[PDB]
Design a protein around this ligand. Structure first.
Ligand SMILES: COc1ccc2c(c1)CC(C)(C)c1c(N)ncnc1-2
Length: 346
């Protein structure tokens, strides 16, 4: 049985061959990543005399079209950030090769989940968490510029990459599930652990869903573990409620899916539907998850510099603003960047 004239496997992936030359230009060196979309290779661009990463999309219409959306959004972001100051991966060019769409990027290092694994899932320092937060809020500010108005829709540690393994510089990747405000099509979006309450509830959404994901990512970067690790949507909402309490009635009153998770009482207040058993609503305090007064996560930052009670209070406050249940009042990128968590003291 033959796929794409022998170039592909049965899963429509290009069969990567070390050393192959493409288009009298690229020498494929090695495979450096693989996922649902296809594969990522390190290649030498002989024309520009530099290493590049080529994302080789599966030869399958659904994957091709997902990557064509990504190409258009990255090209739009390109028109608007030529100095590469806003922390989005740079798409150099694209081409079709042997029935695979191929996206050529600058070569980056490993992702923030790999970085968490490298900490043995104990987390990075509050200082490094702050550097990641500042860069991500800058990226979100750029995506919110009106000519872009891009909702990434799948922010998670795996979609944030280090530029260099020694260093704090990061880029956001993977715009295949993205969309623009006023061209919102998807009802089902975001990876579960990072999914906002408005999406869980079946409500209208906007760029604020990415800020929710960022709040979740930053707590996980410092603790080593996902903040809200739901096994399914009901479990996800229940985990959110353990930390943040029952969502506001004004929100639940307008939520198409309120009754998937909650019940409306005679007095018009809302409670959780019973299990078929969680910490009571709001009793799993972020204050304690972060260890604000008790030496940080697991008490492991006791006796370390750069981890004071005062700095933990600033981090907690910023995260709580990113995790506001109301997407209208949730902190926005411009104001997050001005928050006291980013103000130096001492
Ligand atoms: C499994 O998913 C992966 C694996 C590796 C990478 C990406 C996705 C994203 C891109 C293609 C942007 C990239 C890069 N530019 N440099 C290095 N690695 C990667």
């Amino acid at each position: 049985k033959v796929y794409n004239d022998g170039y592909d496997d049965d899963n429509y992936d290009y069969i990567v061959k070390n050393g192959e030359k493409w288009m009298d230009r690229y020498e494929i060196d090695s495979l450096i990543g693989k996922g649902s979309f296809g594969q990522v290779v390190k290649a030498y661009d002989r024309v520009e005399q530099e290493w590049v990463a080529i994302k080789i999309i599966k030869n399958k219409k659904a994957f091709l079209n997902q990557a064509q959306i990504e190409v258009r959004l990255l090209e739009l972001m390109n028109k608007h950030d030529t100095e590469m100051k806003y922390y989005i991966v740079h798409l150099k060019r694209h081409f079709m090769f042997r029935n695979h769409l191929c996206l050529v990027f600058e070569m980056l290092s490993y992702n923030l989940y790999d970085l968490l694994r490298n900490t043995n899932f104990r987390g990075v320092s509050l200082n490094l968490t702050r550097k990641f937060a500042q860069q991500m809020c800058t990226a979100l500010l750029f995506l919110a510029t009106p000519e872009l108005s891009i909702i990434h829709c799948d922010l998670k540690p795996e979609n944030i990459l280090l530029c260099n393994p020694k260093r704090s510089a990061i880029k956001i990747v993977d715009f295949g599930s993205s969309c623009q405000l006023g061209q919102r099509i998807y009802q089902y979006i975001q990876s579960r652990f990072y999914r906002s309450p408005e999406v869980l509830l079946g409500m209208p959404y906007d760029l604020a869903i990415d800020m929710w994901s960022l709040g979740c990512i930053l707590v996980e970067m410092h603790t080593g573990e996902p903040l809200f690790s739901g096994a399914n949507e009901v479990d996800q909402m229940n985990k959110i409620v353990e930390v943040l309490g029952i969502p506001p009635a004004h929100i639940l009153d307008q939520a198409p899916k309120a009754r998937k998770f909650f019940e409306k009482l005679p007095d018009g207040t809302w409670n959780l539907k019973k299990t078929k058993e969680y910490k009571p609503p709001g009793t799993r305090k972020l204050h304690n998850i972060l260890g604000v007064e008790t030496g940080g996560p697991g008490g492991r930052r006791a006796g370390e510099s750069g981890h004071t009670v005062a700095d933990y209070l600033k981090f907690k406050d910023l995260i709580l603003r990113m995790l506001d249940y109301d997407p209208k009042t949730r902190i926005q990128p411009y104001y997050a960047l001005q928050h006291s968590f980013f103000k130096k003291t001492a």
